[PDB]
Design an enzyme around this catalytic site. Structure first.
Site, PDB file in Angstrom:
ATOM      1  N   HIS A  42      47.666   5.232  -0.610  1.00 23.27           N
ATOM      2  CA  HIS A  42      47.635   6.626  -1.007  1.00 23.27           C
ATOM      3  C   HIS A  42      47.896   7.463   0.210  1.00 23.27           C
ATOM      4  CE1 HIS A  42      46.336  10.382  -2.900  1.00 23.27           C
ATOM      5  NE2 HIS A  42      45.709  10.638  -1.765  1.00 23.27           N
ATOM      6  N   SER A  51      38.339  13.831   3.742  1.00 18.35           N
ATOM      7  CA  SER A  51      37.498  14.003   2.568  1.00 18.35           C
ATOM      8  C   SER A  51      37.286  12.722   1.762  1.00 18.35           C
ATOM      9  CB  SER A  51      38.095  15.087   1.665  1.00 18.35           C
ATOM     10  OG  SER A  51      37.361  15.218   0.459  1.00 18.35           O
ATOM     11  N   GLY A  56      34.520  10.199  -0.442  1.00 19.08           N
ATOM     12  CA  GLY A  56      35.162   9.573  -1.581  1.00 19.08           C
ATOM     13  C   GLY A  56      36.105  10.410  -2.387  1.00 19.08           C
ATOM     14  N   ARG A  58      37.347  12.340  -5.435  1.00 15.55           N
ATOM     15  CA  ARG A  58      36.691  13.029  -6.553  1.00 15.55           C
ATOM     16  C   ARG A  58      37.592  14.051  -7.235  1.00 15.55           C
ATOM     17  NH1 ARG A  58      33.134   9.625  -4.571  1.00 15.55           N
ATOM     18  NH2 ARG A  58      31.509  10.453  -5.961  1.00 15.55           N
ATOM     19  N   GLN A  62      40.161  19.562 -13.254  1.00 15.39           N
ATOM     20  CA  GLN A  62      41.445  19.115 -13.681  1.00 15.39           C
ATOM     21  C   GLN A  62      41.848  19.926 -14.909  1.00 15.39           C
ATOM     22  OE1 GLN A  62      42.818  16.243 -11.566  1.00 15.39           O
ATOM     23  NE2 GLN A  62      41.356  17.749 -10.645  1.00 15.39           N
ATOM     24  N   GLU A 155      54.527   3.384  -9.122  1.00  8.87           N
ATOM     25  CA  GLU A 155      53.351   4.145  -8.757  1.00  8.87           C
ATOM     26  C   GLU A 155      52.190   3.707  -9.649  1.00  8.87           C
ATOM     27  OE1 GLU A 155      54.929   8.213  -9.355  1.00  8.87           O
ATOM     28  OE2 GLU A 155      53.951   8.188 -11.348  1.00  8.87           O
TER      29      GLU A 155
END
Lengths: 207, 823
Positions: A42, A51, A56, A58, A62, A155
């Site tokens: 990623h 971050s 983690g 998060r 959305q 992907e």
């Protein structure tokens, strides 16, 4: 802590601070020993990297009507490499390089990793993705892998639930500060990182 | 004492009673100590803006009798002395000349034991070259007594030799026109004393004392107090032979009436003979005041000597009675200070220190003020009068009456007196005075000339350069103080016009200066004041430039990450003339594209077409690099112009050869294909594209690197000129011209010295020319190395590789392919 040992890790345009290949090999080994598996790379911006690694992955507000909402990653670091950089300029006008992150999930979630040949982002695949995961989109505790676009590289989209259960650590693959926008150079990938980067075998038929 | 603006102004009107001087002295010879004593004595104080102490105002009064001894027109018994500050070390060449150029007199300090040291000898020559009248002071006499315990006669012989050395220099280098300017103790132009204890005297001081006890006009009393003059105690007669009729020795007058009194007080007090001290003291009429009475040892002597022979007055006496006023000196210094016709309307106005004539104000240096990061101009009014509000012509270094280059017809915001650390507003200021101006900072980098006559040339310019050719990376040794460095760097750049602090893409903190030493100093002041935090400084490095030699082999192409936008371009060279033109304000970024086009087209052979399509200059939006828009019918083109420009700013600041700045690079945008929707043509997309295409273009246009080169001017006795060419031939130096000063044996060699070869230059020149050489070097031009930066073994490649490694980049230079589309 899954970062292996050796002094605080940070992300710099200069390079990732305190993260040799050797440390990478230790942290990977330790993640497998606790039952985690590597599923992709990623790429993103320094601020972002920090971050994710300390805090983690998060989701956050959305678009609930967004059926392909998730955490995109890629088996091929080259494809991830492309997003490893600021997406907009700073006030002065600089677009600095980013960082490449190694994404791991609890091996216990592989049952939800599927694959297809159709191309993700559009409707024609929706039905088939939904067919494979057993419920209407968006993805949840499951993930889909397929061509980024016709003939493109592949992907992987981990659904937000699953994404939040990842464990991400630095790659020993550096972004170039003097060639932001260039394509990842295959010889800059450590042979040793290449060894620990195989992907799991994803199912092509529903469960 | 305290004075009102009126008192000062009033005092500044009687130029005949003003004294502009400096103090030529090695720091280890009480330079600072003596100077202080004058301040603690005649320092002028005014009856919220602070500045960097550049000059101190001194007030001194004398008797109508004394005023007569002055062999130069005067008026009144009051005098204004401008003590202009000097550097500590000689290496500061350029600024040493600066202070001298604005002074008329000079208080040269020599040591008793050591005499005239090399450094002081050199500055003296320079002072003499500007036609400065010297006045000597033999300091540190105490060290002679206390330490060496020298006899009255041996100490005499010493001063004799010392004064002799000085005059060997004064006569050998002063101008025959000036007339005999040698110092003579008998004529009151040589004082002796000790800055430490705070005492000093002149023959003229003891002569005014013993003045009548012998029935003499001090003229002949001081004349006797030096040389071969004797007073037989027994015959009680004055003789001119060191023996009496019988053959017995006779103590010299100096030893008898000057050195003896002093020698006894020393012997008495330092031996604690309390029976004698009181007696001895009352004889010289030295009255201890209560508390001082109990003192003994050094403590005592120190106080006795101060009351006896006040060091401050001895010096203030010679300054007034022998140093020229800004009237006597400008008459013979004008021609030398005006680079125009020796009969020009102004040159004349300089000679006559005429306050009615067109302004002729000289700016010697810019000084840092508390009022923002602004700087006040420091200088002298050689003609006419400067006044607040007055609009003046600010003629910079490159100005020439003919053209309009480097001119800034602006208005003088405020005129202020440089009262040391504080400034005091004043309406006007007539010729002959050292004054300060407010509001020129953005027109004058450091030196310059202010005038009113449209046909006025500049005055002897002092070459200075703001070209960062040497820089280092500063890091904090202990990460906690990081913010304290981020502040000091901001502070440092604020204190000096020519220092630079910036951040590289790598995020490093850079400090770049005019040269090795200039930077050196800056770094000290940073780790000690501006930041006061311990730092990690990298080794000194020369700033290079990346450039192209031809047009790009083939078109360069790059596409955004979207893979939706493309930029086609080619890079080609810019002619040094144009580059220089850009660097010299001719071709200007802020100009009217049309006017500017006309210029480039006409005077520089550019297609008015191309020139009207300049999109931007670079770096910092004004460098000698350009982007020409040669596209044809590209829809939306203007909507990516800011990005493209932005990209260009970074491409030109840190090129692809090894992160150095680009110079003389022409970028012609041949084509562009953009996505119909703006969403996909944002900065994040175009900026990298352009930046990468440019790199590509550049790497294809035959890459080369330029090195900066100094123009060093050197003063040196014909005898030591040998050492010059000696060292120049081991540094790739190139002699430009060598001349001799008509009268004297003072040659003045000028040559080209590659900046990357100038490290520790002065130090080596020191040994080579027995220290007789006086350097003055400035940035001159950029030199394109012939070798291929791409070939590691070549000379340039060698520079490149090392640099790359230093910066921890990939050892090899990127091929154009890496930046071209990966097709």
């Amino acid at each position: 802590e899954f970062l292996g040992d050796g002094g605080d890790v940070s992300f710099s345009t200069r390079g990732t601070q305190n993260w040799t290949v050797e440390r990478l090999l230790q942290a990977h080994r330790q993640l497998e020993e606790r039952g985690y598996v590597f599923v992709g790379y990623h790429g993103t911006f320094l601020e972002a990297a920090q971050s994710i690694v300390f805090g983690g992955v998060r989701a956050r507000s959305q678009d609930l009507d967004a059926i392909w909402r998730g955490f995109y990653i890629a088996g091929d670091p080259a494809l991830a490499y492309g997003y490893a950089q600021d997406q907009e300029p700073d006030a002065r006008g600089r677009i600095r390089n980013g960082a490449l992150l190694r994404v791991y999930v609890p091996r216990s979630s592989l049952p939800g990793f599927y694959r297809t040949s159709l191309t993700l982002a559009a409707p024609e695949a929706a039905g088939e993705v939904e067919r494979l995961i057993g419920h209407p989109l968006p993805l949840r505790l499951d993930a889909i892998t397929g061509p980024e676009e016709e003939g493109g590289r592949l992907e992987t989209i981990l659904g937000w639930p699953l994404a939040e259960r990842t464990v991400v650590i630095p790659s020993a693959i550096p972004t170039d500060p003097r060639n932001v926008g260039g394509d990842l150079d295959p010889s800059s990938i450590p042979d040793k990182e290449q060894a620990i980067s195989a992907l799991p075998d994803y199912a092509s038929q529903p469960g | 004492v305290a004075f009102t603006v009126d008192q000062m102004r009033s005092l500044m009107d009687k130029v005949t009673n003003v004294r502009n001087m400096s103090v030529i002295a090695h720091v280890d010879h009480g330079k600072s100590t003596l100077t202080d004593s004058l301040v603690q004595r005649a320092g002028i104080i005014s009856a919220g803006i602070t500045i960097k102490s550049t000059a101190i105002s001194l007030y001194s009064e004398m008797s109508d009798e004394d005023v007569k001894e002055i062999k130069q027109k005067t008026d009144g018994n009051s005098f204004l002395i401008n003590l202009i500050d000097s550097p500590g070390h000689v290496d500061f060449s350029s600024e040493v000349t600066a202070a001298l150029r604005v002074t008329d007199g000079a208080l040269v300090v020599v040591d008793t034991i050591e005499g005239v040291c090399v450094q002081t000898e050199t500055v003296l020559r320079q002072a003499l070259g500007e036609r400065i009248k010297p006045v000597v002071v033999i300091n540190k006499v105490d060290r002679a007594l206390l330490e060496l315990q020298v006899s009255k006669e041996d100490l005499y012989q010493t001063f004799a030799r010392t004064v002799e050395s000085v005059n060997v220099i004064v006569s050998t280098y002063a101008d025959e026109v000036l007339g005999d300017v040698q110092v003579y103790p008998a004529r009151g132009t040589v004082a002796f004393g000790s800055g430490l204890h705070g005492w000093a005297f002149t023959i003229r001081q003891f002569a005014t004392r013993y003045a009548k006890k012998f029935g003499v006009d001090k003229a002949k009393m001081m004349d006797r107090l030096w040389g071969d003059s004797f007073f037989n105690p027994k015959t009680k007669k004055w003789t001119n032979k060191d023996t009496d009729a019988e053959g017995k020795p006779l103590e010299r007058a100096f030893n008898m009436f000057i050195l003896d009194p002093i020698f006894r007080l020393f012997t008495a007090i330092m031996n604690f003979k309390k029976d004698e001290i009181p007696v001895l003291l009352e004889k010289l009429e030295i009255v201890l005041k209560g508390d001082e009475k109990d003192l003994e040892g050094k403590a005592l002597l120190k106080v006795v000597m101060r009351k006896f022979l006040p060091a401050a007055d001895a010096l203030l006496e010679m300054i007034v009675l022998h140093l020229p006023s800004p009237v006597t000196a400008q008459a013979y210094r004008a021609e030398q200070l005006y680079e125009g016709p020796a009969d020009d309307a102004n040159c004349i106005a300089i000679k006559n220190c005429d306050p009615k004539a067109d302004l002729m104000l000289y700016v010697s240096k810019m000084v840092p003020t508390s009022d923002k990061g602004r700087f006040y101009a420091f200088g002298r009014v050689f003609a006419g009068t400067v006044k607040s509000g007055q609009k003046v012509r600010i003629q910079g270094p490159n100005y020439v009456p003919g053209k309009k280059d480097d001119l800034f017809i602006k208005a003088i915001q405020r005129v202020v007196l440089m009262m040391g650390r504080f400034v005091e507003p004043i309406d006007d200021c007539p010729a002959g005075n050292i004054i300060g101006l407010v509001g020129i900072d953005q027109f004058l980098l450091k030196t310059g000339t202010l005038t009113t006559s449209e046909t006025a040339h500049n005055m002897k310019v002092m070459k200075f350069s703001v070209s960062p050719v040497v820089q280092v990376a500063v890091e904090v040794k202990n990460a906690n103080d990081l913010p304290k460095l981020v502040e000091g760097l901001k502070r440092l750049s604020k204190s000096d016009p020519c220092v630079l602090t910036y951040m590289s893409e790598s995020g490093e903190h850079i400090v770049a200066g005019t040269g090795e030493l200039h930077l050196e100093i800056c770094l000290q002041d940073l780790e000690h004041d501006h930041a006061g935090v311990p730092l990690k400084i990298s080794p000194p490095v020369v700033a290079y430039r990346e450039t192209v030699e031809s047009e790009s082999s083939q078109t360069a192409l790059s596409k955004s990450p979207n893979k939706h936008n493309r930029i086609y371009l080619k890079a080609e060279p810019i002619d040094e003339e144009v580059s220089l033109a850009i660097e010299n304000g001719i071709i200007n970024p802020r100009d009217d594209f049309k006017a500017r086009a006309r210029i480039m087209a006409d005077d520089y052979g550019w297609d008015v077409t191309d020139a009207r399509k300049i999109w931007c200059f670079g770096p910092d939006g004004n460098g000698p690099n350009l982007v020409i828009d040669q596209t044809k019918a590209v829809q939306y083109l203007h909507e990516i112009k800011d990005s493209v420009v932005a990209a260009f700013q970074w491409a030109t600041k840190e090129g692809p050869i090894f992160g150095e700045e680009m110079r003389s690079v022409r970028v012609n945008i041949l084509d562009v294909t953009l996505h119909a929707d703006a969403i996909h043509r944002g900065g994040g997309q175009i900026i990298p594209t352009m930046r990468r295409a440019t790199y590509a273009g550049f790497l294809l246009a035959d890459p080369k690197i330029q090195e900066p080169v100094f123009l060093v001017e050197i003063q040196c006795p014909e005898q030591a000129v040998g050492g010059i060419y000696s060292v120049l031939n081991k540094k790739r130096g190139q002699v430009v011209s060598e001349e001799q000063r008509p009268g004297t044996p003072l040659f003045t060699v000028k040559a080209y010295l590659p900046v990357n070869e100038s490290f520790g230059f002065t130090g080596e020149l020191r040994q080579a020319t027995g220290g007789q050489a006086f350097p003055q070097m400035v940035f001159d031009h950029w030199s394109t190395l012939g070798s291929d930066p791409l070939d590691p073994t070549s000379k340039a490649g060698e520079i490149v590789l090392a640099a790359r490694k230093r910066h921890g980049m990939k050892e090899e230079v990127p091929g154009w392919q890496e930046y071209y589309d990966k097709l």
